[PDB]
TrEMBL record, chain B:
Disulfide bonds join 16-58, 26-48. One of its GO terms (cellular component) is respiratory chain complex III. GO terms for molecular function: quinol-cytochrome-c reductase activity. It is found in: Mitochondrion inner membrane. The lineage of its organism: Eukaryota, Fungi, Dikarya, Ascomycota, Saccharomycotina. This is YALI0F24673p. The chain holds residues 66 to 136 of 137 of the full protein. Residues 2-71 form the Ubiquinol-cytochrome C reductase hinge domain.
UniProtKB/TrEMBL annotation, chain D:
This is Cytochrome b-c1 complex subunit Rieske, mitochondrial. Residues 15-110 form the Rieske domain. Belongs to the Rieske iron-sulfur protein family. The lineage of its organism: Eukaryota, Fungi, Dikarya, Ascomycota, Saccharomycotina. The Rieske protein is a high potential 2Fe-2S protein. [2Fe-2S] cluster binds at residues 55, 57-60, 74, 77. It is found in: Mitochondrion inner membrane.
UniProtKB/TrEMBL annotation, chain E:
The Rieske protein is a high potential 2Fe-2S protein. This is Cytochrome b-c1 complex subunit Rieske, mitochondrial. It is found in: Mitochondrion inner membrane. It comes from the Eukaryota. Belongs to the Rieske iron-sulfur protein family. The chain crosses the membrane at residues 25-46.
Automatic annotation (TrEMBL), chain G:
This is Complex III subunit 9. Keywords: Electron transport, Membrane, Mitochondrion, Mitochondrion inner membrane, Respiratory chain, Transmembrane, Transmembrane helix, Transport. It comes from Yarrowia lipolytica (strain CLIB 122 / E 150). GO terms for cellular component: mitochondrial inner membrane; respiratory chain complex III. GO terms for biological process: mitochondrial electron transport, ubiquinol to cytochrome c. It is a single-pass membrane protein.
Length: 124, 71, 244, 111, 61, 85, 54, 383, 110
């Protein structure tokens, strides 16, 4: 899937009062059970990056954000290999789980999808 | 004489008594049914194999170890 | 399927050779050979066993050569190219009772007695099945069983009707070692013997397995020490991050 | 009686069918038959049922005289064949194949 | 948390006698044991396995 | 997507100090008893449902099916078998 | 202990030689030890135990 | 520059087994790759050895296997090792494929190693099936009969193809000789494809259990994974030893110790345990051709996982619903296995059909649905 | 030098492959070939005779020898193929020589 698709669909759900009332609590529990925060990851650290689009979005990250991401990946890898979980300040608190990457990938994809559309234009 | 004979008899009278009685009752029914005429022109002819298996399976469970101990 | 169609499953008897560290009882093997020779060999072949195979298992070299030398086997033709017989040698296979399948079936009301060299591996149950079968002919078939002609009722045999009649009765064999030859004793001995025939490497196999288990276990323990030793720098790594 | 002749490794069932057997086979309405055929299509001589005795399901050999339509019973998956060797009950899709056989003499056939 | 000259705490894992010959020797005894059983195991494996190529019992008769 | 040593394809790293000690200076089995007990308990407890639920369900299914099949091929199950065929 | 290290471990040529000599000794002695153990747990069962009758 | 890097030949070994950069957090399920390599080596060594004692003629095949068991020095070991390692090869291969599905190893950028892998799995099935026939016992024959009669369902040409493969009108001597030649050859083909899937993988490197990049933190393949691979080698050899020396016939079927008899059909023809799930799938479809297509599709459908998994996240470590669905999928695959060996009787007929539907619906319906919904939950749940 | 040296081994494997293949026919030249050639191994001091009997699988060329040569003759061509591939990979570093013996780096053709 494209991040664009995920973001658009999520926005449709958050708009509908009924839908949000039932989905947002589920999604919060899902994320709690998912347990990525116990390895000190932010959600966006889990998105697959071996794609041209994602490589481009990562290159567009501000240097600080990029350095921090590298640290979170290295730290998580070390907890994984040790079979330990994050404790204390290493655990990602819900307020720290910011979508740092979503804006960049949405811009990269926006252009890529426009390019595909315009490659198929027909002068009327 | 064959040790198995005594061990099998003892296990039938003792721990496998319910199964012994089942087989016996079955045999009674089937023999009586065979005695009656137009048995040969019946659809279903009952056997006692099931009950026999239940009994033998039980006897073997209670005897196997004891028998090989005396050979 | 009906249980009848499957056959009754044989009990698990405590054979001497059951057990990771247990060999066959060779005295039982010898007695079992004598039952084979005096009872089964009338109808059943043991084609995969040579006289040499008994040597140092059940019999001395002299006893086995004596058994071989009592028989006649086909020799190479003489100088006029006429057929000839010779006395048996240790390399000869134990000869069967019938020349071909047709002769075998004709003697057994149509049924073909299988070769027994692999029968312990060729039936679910193994020794237990052979033991159960030979000892499991009831005096009377369960009421309501209709036996086909030339069949005998035996619950362990799938379908119930077997072409082999009960053959082991108290004192059909006179054991040379003074063991009382009861039906159960003879079945236990012959079933041991046939199990040996099917897997003659059994004793050596289990001893080599014991050595293998020990060495491989030790190497496993040491491999874990070595792994943990070499990996400890990676497991013990620590980081300090100062955001730039 | 039914004979079993090996012919190309497959078994050949040859049954010398009695009068009443032929009658039994000529009863079943063709309509109600997975593989619709009459005995006349199968045999070229009503007293000589010649079939390839491999079951049409997977390819086990039916035990003859057994069954529920008293012809042949495949023990493998329990499919019942007729006195024509037509499939009546069980997994098997087709009737037991008929080889190409010709009566050279009235006492010998080639297959 | 900030100074990189303050080495993190390794005291749970540090051996006191780490620079002794005793210490090294022990670990090489483990490595050497493992090599010894591997050598003995390889010899056994090879010798048993290749013996299949020697004259079989029927030939020897 | 992966390079080689020296140009592996990491985003630039800066600001991480890594420290480790020699295998000969470390106790390889330090805290092994605590880990074998408490760590394994934690890790197993966390994953237990994902094994228990599917295994227990499929075992129940099989148990019911095998018991029915057994019963259909008894004398008592003759009629139910006749309908099932 | 330093002595032991210096002699048998420091040079790999010596270490490998020590491992192979140990392997030889282990192989020989382990064979003998298992043989005896196997004979004791399977006592009176093996051909060697009944051979004497013949 | 070091010789291992300078010299072209050495450098190829170096790049794969020594300096190869690996993620530092591979868990023990990454060890099945090397166990499969060990199985492949044991099968080549024992296989070539048995070929030196086996005779491919149908009048002599079964007897040659008895000669191996009875006369050849350590023949029993070589035979049982070869037969049991075939079972261990399938345990390891199912584990390795299970690892790949759970951790999303099939996703970009690793679609090519995965797709070659699916072919390796097909060649392993064919290899093992032909090897089974070589014994020429009852299961050998009745296996070859049944399986090669499925080819008859190919429309128009099917019958002709069967007779061409058998080299006659039934399974017999021609079939046995040709299966021997092919069974010898197929493991070499399998080795080449195994090597191709590794070369394909070298572009991306190994995935890891977190599903994130490992480019940030790599470890040389040697010594770390060398020594970790030894632990599973010794664990494998312990299991091998228990089967080969103590219970060599536990995984097999007694019927194969009866010489093939084209007349007598054995009590029950079931394949070797590792084929049983596909056999259950085949039984589920009543149509002969349908059944064959379904059975092949059950393997080829693995090729579409790269499409039907719509997740933005690689692997199941962090996806609780996907983990549950995967658990059900795996257990159903085992239930299919068990239903492959029951009799075709009520109530297992219907049950086998339901399990078959569940098997396919994982790829076609559930995985696409579940992966889509988890995408939305991760995004909304972290807002 | 490396492609050349691997090549010398390819040539040895080809000789062995062809020799074993010749024995498989089991005609007179097959047998008498295997007899004489495997008795050259008898010249290896001390262990020579033992090695011969081990290769034959008996005391003469017979069935054991024939079966083992079949298995090896099947296998050896695959080994030969691997070495053929190694000598090419080795050669890839320098590329082909040419009949003038000069560099071709100045003038290449696909
Ligand atoms: C076959 C030939 C023999 C060769 C041996 C190879 C087998 C080794 C292997 O891959 O599995 C060991 C493997 C240990 O691997 P690991 O590297 O410690 O952790 C891998 C997972 O991340 C471990 O996952 P985790 O960290 O979440 O811990 C889970 C695990 C606990 O893991 C253990 O340490 C055990 O316990 C369970 O999941 C048990 C299920 C609960 C039922 C009660 O054990 C399991 O993971 C078993 C769970 C599988 C279901
Ligand atoms: C397969 C059979 C393997 C048999 C191993 C035979 C002995 C080699 C051995 O144990 O290696 C130890 C040796 C030494 O291990 P090491 O390299 O860790 O020791 C070097 C440091 N000193 C010399 C101070 C001990 O390993 C090798 O030489 C590699 C050969 C293994 C193959
Ligand atoms: C039986 C059902 C298995 C379901 C597994 C569910 C996950 C689980 O608990 O496993 C533990 C572990 C969980 O490991 P993990 O990597 O997800 O979690 C590690 C710990 N955290 C979450 C903190 C990062 O899963 C595995 O290791 C799964 C490997 C799959 C192997 C399956 C082989 C089956 C063959 C069928 C072939 C077709
Ligand atoms: C090819 C098949 C590989 C499978 C190997 C597993 C065990 C087989 C070994 C044979 C065996 O029975 O050996 C036993 C000891 O086991 C052992 O000690 C062997 C287990 C050790 C593990 C293997 C370690 C290396 C093996 C592989 C290397 C082979 C080629 C490399 C040069 C006892 O037999 P015995 O002690 O009577 O034997 C005579 C020497 N006294
Ligand atoms: C099967 C039998 C296993 C063989 C045992 C090998 C003996 C190991 C002891 C020797 C040892 O530790 O020294 C290292 C040798 O290991 C090595 O060089 C080999 C490391 C481990 C070998 C196995 C690698 C993976 C095994 C899985 C099989 C793969 C599938 C193919 C069948 C040197 O190395 P160092 O760097 O530690 O030395 C550090 C200083 N010099
Ligand atoms: C005079 C005939 C005869 C004697 C004596 C005889 N058998 Fe048999 N046996 C048969 C025949 C006939 C069959 C085939 C039965 C059938 O397939 O219905 C058979 C079958 C067997 C079977 C195989 C049953 C199966 O599962 O297929 C075993 C095992 C067996 N015999 C062992 C023995 C042993 C052990 C003895 C004596 C110690 C023995 N037999 C004595 C005629 C004999
Ligand atoms: C002879 C059979 C096989 C051998 C010897 C083999 C060997 C290996 C090895 C050594 C690796 C790298 C180490 C590892 O991850 O375990 C690997 C990775 C892989 N194999 Fe296999 N393999 C075999 C069969 C298969 C099959 C059947 C599949 C797929 C259906 C497959 C798909 C993969 C994939 C996708 C990877 C990359 C996984 C990753 O590291 O993320 N292989 N294999
Ligand atoms: C992936 C590799 C292989 C697998 C999975 C495999 C599998 C099998 C299997 C399952 C059998 C049936 C074993 C039995 O029940 O007795 C067998 C037999 C056989 N295999 Fe293989 N095999 C492989 C490689 C080889 C190779 C390379 C050879 C080289 C010739 C070979 C030669 C034989 C021979 C001669 C037999 C028949 C003797 C026997 O049954 O033991 N195999 N194989
Ligand atoms: C199966 C046997 C062999 C095959 C298939 C094979 C194939 C080839 C091929 C395709 C090339 C590159 C093209 C060419 O120059 O002709 C080549 C080059 C070469 N081969 Fe072979 N070869 C084989 C045996 C040998 C042998 C026996 C030797 C040496 C004793 C050898 C030594 C070389 C050398 C030194 C080159 C480089 C020559 C150059 O281009 O200047 N090869 N071989
Ligand atoms: C490059 C490697 C060097 C060449 C490799 C040599 C291969 C063949 C050498 C020995 C093979 C025959 O050597 C012989 O081995 C077998 C078992 O393996 C041993 O046999 C011994 O152990 C086995 C079980 O382990 C018993 O069944 C046997 O009764 C006993 O004598 C002999 O005591 C030994 O004389
Ligand atoms: C697995 C068994 C062990 C034998 C090796 C497997 C045989 C497969 C090797 C043949 C394929 C060629 O392998 C290919 O070669 C070159 C160098 O060797 C590697 O190249 C890699 O390593 C070298 C240095 O080590 C670097 O210059 C290069 O930047 C890097 O990508 C490729 O990543 C690999 O794909
Ligand atoms: S094979 Fe004939 S009934 Fe299935």
């Amino acid at each position: 899937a494209s991040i664009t698709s995920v973001v658009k669909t999520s926005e449709l759900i958050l708009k509908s009062p009924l839908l949000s009332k039932i989905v947002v609590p589920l999604a919060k529990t899902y994320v709690k059970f998912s347990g990525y925060r116990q390895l000190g990851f932010k959600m966006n650290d889990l998105i697959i990056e071996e794609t041209p689009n994602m490589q481009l979005a990562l290159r567009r990250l501000p240097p600080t954000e990029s350095y921090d991401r590298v640290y979170r990946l290295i730290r998580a890898t070390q907890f994984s290999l040790s079979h330990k979980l994050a404790t204390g300040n290493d655990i990602t608190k819900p307020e720290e789980d910011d979508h740092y990457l979503i804006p960049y990938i949405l811009d990269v994809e926006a252009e890529a999808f426009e390019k595909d559309a315009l490659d198929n234009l027909e002068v009327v | 004489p064959d040790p198995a004979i005594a061990l099998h008899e003892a296990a039938a009278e003792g721990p496998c008594h319910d199964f012994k009685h089942h087989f016996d009752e079955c045999v009674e029914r089937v023999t009586k049914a065979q005695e009656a005429e137009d048995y040969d022109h019946a659809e279903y002819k009952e056997d006692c194999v099931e009950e026999f298996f239940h009994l033998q399976h039980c006897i073997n469970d209670n005897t196997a170890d004891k028998l090989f101990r005396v050979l | 399927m009906t249980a009848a169609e499957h056959g009754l499953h044989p009990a698990e008897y405590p054979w001497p050779q059951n057990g990771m560290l247990s060999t066959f009882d060779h005295a039982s093997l010898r007695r079992g050979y004598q039952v084979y020779k005096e009872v089964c060999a009338a109808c059943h072949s043991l084609d995969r066993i040579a006289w040499r195979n008994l040597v140092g298992v059940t019999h001395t070299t002299d006893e086995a050569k004596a058994f071989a030398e009592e028989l006649e086997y086909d020799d190479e033709p003489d100088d006029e190219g006429n057929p000839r017989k010779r006395p048996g040698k240790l390399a000869d296979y134990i000869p069967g009772p019938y020349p071909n399948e047709q002769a075998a079936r004709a003697a057994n009301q149509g049924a073909l007695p299988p070769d027994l060299s692999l029968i312990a591996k060729a039936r679910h149950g193994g020794a237990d099945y052979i033991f159960a079968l030979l000892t499991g002919y009831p005096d009377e078939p369960p009421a309501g069983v209709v036996l086909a002609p030339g069949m005998n009722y035996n619950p362990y045999f799938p379908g119930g009707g077997i072409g082999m009649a009960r053959t082991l009765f108290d004192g059909v064999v006179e054991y040379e070692d003074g063991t009382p030859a009861t039906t159960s004793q003879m079945a236990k001995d012959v079933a041991a013997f046939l199990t040996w025939a099917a897997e003659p490497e059994h004793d050596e196999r289990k001893k080599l397995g014991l050595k293998a288990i020990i060495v491989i276990s030790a190497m496993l323990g040491l491999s874990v020490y070595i792994k943990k030793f070499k990996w400890s720098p990676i497991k013990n790594r620590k980081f300090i991050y100062n955001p730039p | 009686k039914n004979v079993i002749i090996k012919w190309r490794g497959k078994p050949i069932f040859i049954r010398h069918r009695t009068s009443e057997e032929i009658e039994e086979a000529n009863e079943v309405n063709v309509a109600t038959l997975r593989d619709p055929q009459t005995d006349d299509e199968r045999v070229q001589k009503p007293e000589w049922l010649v079939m390839i005795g491999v079951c049409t399901h997977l390819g086990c050999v039916p035990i003859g005289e057994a069954g529920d339509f008293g012809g042949w019973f495949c023990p493998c998956h329990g499919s019942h064949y007729d006195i024509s060797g037509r499939i009546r009950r069980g997994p098997a899709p087709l009737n037991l194949e008929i080889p190409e056989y010709d009566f050279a003499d009235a006492e010998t056939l080639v297959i | 948390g900030k100074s990189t000259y303050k080495i993190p705490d390794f005291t749970p894992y540090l051996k006191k006698d780490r620079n002794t010959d005793a210490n090294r020797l022990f670990s090489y005894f483990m490595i050497g044991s493992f090599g010894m059983l591997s050598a003995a195991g390889a010899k056994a494996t090879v010798q048993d396995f290749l013996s299949n190529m020697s004259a079989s019992a029927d030939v020897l008769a | 997507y992966m390079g080689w040593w020296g140009h592996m394809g990491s985003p630039p790293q800066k600001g991480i100090a890594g420290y480790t000690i020699s295998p000969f200076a470390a106790r390889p089995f330090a805290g092994v008893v605590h880990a074998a007990i408490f760590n394994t308990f934690r890790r197993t407890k966390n994953q237990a449902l994902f094994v228990i639920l599917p295994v227990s369900f499929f075992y129940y299914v099989w148990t019911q099916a095998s018991e029915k099949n057994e019963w259909l091929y008894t004398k008592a199950g003759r009629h139910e078998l006749a309908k099932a065929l | 202990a330093t002595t032991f290290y210096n002699v048998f471990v420091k040079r790999n040529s010596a270490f490998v030689a020590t491992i192979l000599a140990s392997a030889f000794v282990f192989d020989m002695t382990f064979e003998t030890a298992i043989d005896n153990f196997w004979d004791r747990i399977n006592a009176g069962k093996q051909w060697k135990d009944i051979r004497h009758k013949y | 520059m070091a010789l291992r890097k300078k010299n072209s030949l050495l450098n190829m070994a170096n790049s794969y087994v020594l300096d190869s950069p690996q993620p530092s957090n591979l868990n023990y399920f990454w060890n099945f790759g090397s166990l499969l390599a060990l199985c492949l080596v044991i099968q080549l060594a024992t296989g070539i050895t048995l070929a030196m004692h086996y005779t491919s003629h149908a009048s002599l095949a079964f007897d040659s296997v008895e000669h191996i068991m009875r006369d050849v020095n350590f023949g029993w070991f070589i035979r049982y090792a070869h037969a049991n390692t075939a079972s261990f090869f399938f345990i390891c291969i199912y584990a390795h494929m299970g690892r790949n599905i759970y951790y999303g190893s099939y996703k970009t950028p690793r679609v090519l190693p995965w797709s070659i892998g699916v072919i390796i799995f097909l060649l392993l099935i064919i290899t093992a099936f032909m090897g089974y026939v070589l014994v020429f016992g009852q299961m050998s024959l009745w296996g070859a009969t049944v399986i090669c009669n499925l080819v008859s369902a190919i429309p128009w040409l099917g019958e002709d193809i069967v007779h061409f493969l058998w080299g006659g009108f039934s399974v017999g001597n021609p079939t046995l000789q040709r299966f021997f030649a092919l069974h010898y050859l197929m493991p070499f083909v399998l080795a080449v494809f195994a090597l191709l899937h590794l070369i394909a993988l070298h572009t991306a490197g190994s995935s890891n259990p977190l599903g994130i990049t490992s480019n940030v933190d790599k470890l040389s393949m040697h010594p770390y994974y060398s020594f970790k691979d030894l632990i599973t080698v010794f664990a494998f050899l312990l299991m091998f030893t228990l089967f080969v020396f103590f219970s060599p016939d536990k995984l097999g079927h007694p019927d194969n110790y009866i010489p093939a008899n084209p007349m007598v059909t054995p009590a029950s023809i079931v394949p070797e345990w590792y084929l049983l799930p596909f056999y259950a799938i085949l039984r589920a479809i009543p149509d002969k051709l349908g059944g064959v297509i379904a059975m092949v599709a059950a393997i080829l459908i693995l090729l579409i996982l790269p499409i039907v998994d719509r997740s933005i996240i690689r692997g199941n470590a962090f996806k609780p619903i996907s983990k549950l669905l995967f658990g059900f999928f795996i257990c159903n695959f085992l239930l299919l296995g068990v239903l492959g060996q029951v009799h075709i009787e009520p109530p297992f007929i219907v049950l086998g059909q339901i399990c078959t539907i569940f098997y396919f619906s994982y790829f076609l319906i559930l995985l696409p649905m579940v992966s889509t919904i988890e995408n939305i939950f991760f995004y909304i749940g972290s807002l």
